[PDB]
Amino acid sequence: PRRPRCPGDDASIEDLHEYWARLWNYLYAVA
Amino acid sequence: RRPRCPGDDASIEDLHEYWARLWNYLYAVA
Amino acid sequence: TEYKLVVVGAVGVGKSALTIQLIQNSYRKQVVIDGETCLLDILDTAGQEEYSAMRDQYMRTGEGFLCVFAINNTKSFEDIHHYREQIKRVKDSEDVPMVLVGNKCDLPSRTVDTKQAQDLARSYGIPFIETSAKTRQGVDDAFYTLVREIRKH
Ligand SMILES: Nc1nc2c(ncn2[C@@H]2O[C@H](COP(=O)(O)OP(=O)(O)O)[C@@H](O)[C@H]2O)c(=O)[nH]1
Ligand SMILES: [Ca+2]
Ligand SMILES: [Ca+2]
Ligand SMILES: [Mg+2]
C-alpha cells in the first residue's frame, strides 16, 4: 500500500486522473 | 480552478479532503 | 464509514446550491445519521452532460445518487428518466441507491406538483423529498435519506 505522489502543476488532466485513481485505491486499502 | 497538491506530510483526512476536490474538478474539465 | 454521493440533473436546478448548503450551510462533511457517524463525499456534476470515459468512472465511484429537478422546470422533471438510465448504465445495476429530489420548493410558482413526482419515485421504488437550497429546507434530509438507501442495499 504505497502512498501516491501528487504530480506538480505541470501535470496534465490524465496525470491527475491517474493520481485520482491511485489516491482512491490508497485511501480504500488504508481504511 | 485546479486544487493544489496536499503535500508530502498531508494526513489521511487531508487526502480525503483533496480527493473530493479533485473529484469535482476532473469531472468539470472533462 | 465512507459514503460517495453524486448529484445529477438538468443545469440550473440547483445541484451546486444544494451542495453548498450541505457543506458550508469543500465537498466533504462529517455527519451523524441514525446514530451512526458518516463521512460524506459529494460529487457536484458541473457543466452539461457529454460523452466521457473518465466522467463515467467518476460516477461509477458514486454509491448514491440524487436525481435533482426543479419544481418550476418541466423539462428538468422529464429528464429524470434520462439521468436514471445513465446511472444504471454506468453502475451496471438495475437497483442503485437513489433519491428523487424536487428543488426550489420555496417558489410559489410551480409547474411540477408533488403528486406527479411522488408517483414517479413510487414507480422507481425510491424516496422523494422536496428541497429548498434558499431556505435550507429538506437539504439535509435529501442527502441523509440517500445514505439510508445505501445502507438498505
Ligand atoms: N429559489 C431558489 N432558487 C434556487 C434554489 N437552488 C438554486 N437556485 C437558483 O438557481 C441558480 C443556479 O443554480 P445552480 O446550483 O448553479 O444550478 P446547477 O448547479 O446547474 O444545478 C442560482 O442562481 C440560484 O439562485 C432553491 O432551492 N430555491
Ligand atoms: Ca468536454
Ligand atoms: Ca468528451
Ligand atoms: Mg452547478
Author numbering:
A (entry chain C): 2 to 32
B (entry chain B): 3 to 32
C (entry chain A): 2 to 26, 39 to 166
Copy the relevant paper text:
The Ras proteins are master regulators of cell proliferation and survival that transduce growth stimuli emanating from cell-surface receptors to cytoplasmic kinases responsible for orchestrating a comprehensive cell division program. Ras proteins are cytosolic, membrane-bound GTPases that bind guanine nucleotides and are regulated by their nucleotide state: guanosine triphosphate (GTP)–bound Ras adopts a conformation that binds Ras effector proteins with high affinity, leading to their activation and downstream signaling, whereas guanosine diphosphate (GDP)–bound Ras adopts a conformation that cannot bind effectors and thus is inactive. Here, we report our initial findings on an alternative approach, one that exploits directed evolution to discover miniproteins having extraordinarily high affinity for the most functionally relevant surface of Ras, the effector domain. High-resolution crystal structures demonstrate that the miniproteins bind Ras as a dimer and interact via a distinct binding mode that captures the Ras effector domain in an open conformational state, which can be stabilized by insertion of a proline at Asp-38 in Ras.
The 225-11 miniprotein did not possess significant nucleotide selectivity, which was consistent in a general sense with the crystal structure of 225-11 bound to KRas-GppNHp as the nucleotide-responsive switch I loop was dislodged and the miniprotein did not come into close proximity to the nucleotide. Our data reveal a previously unobserved Ras binding mode wherein a miniprotein dimer disrupts the switch I loop and β-strand 2 of Ras and engages β-strands 1–3 and switch II, primarily through a single miniprotein α-helix.
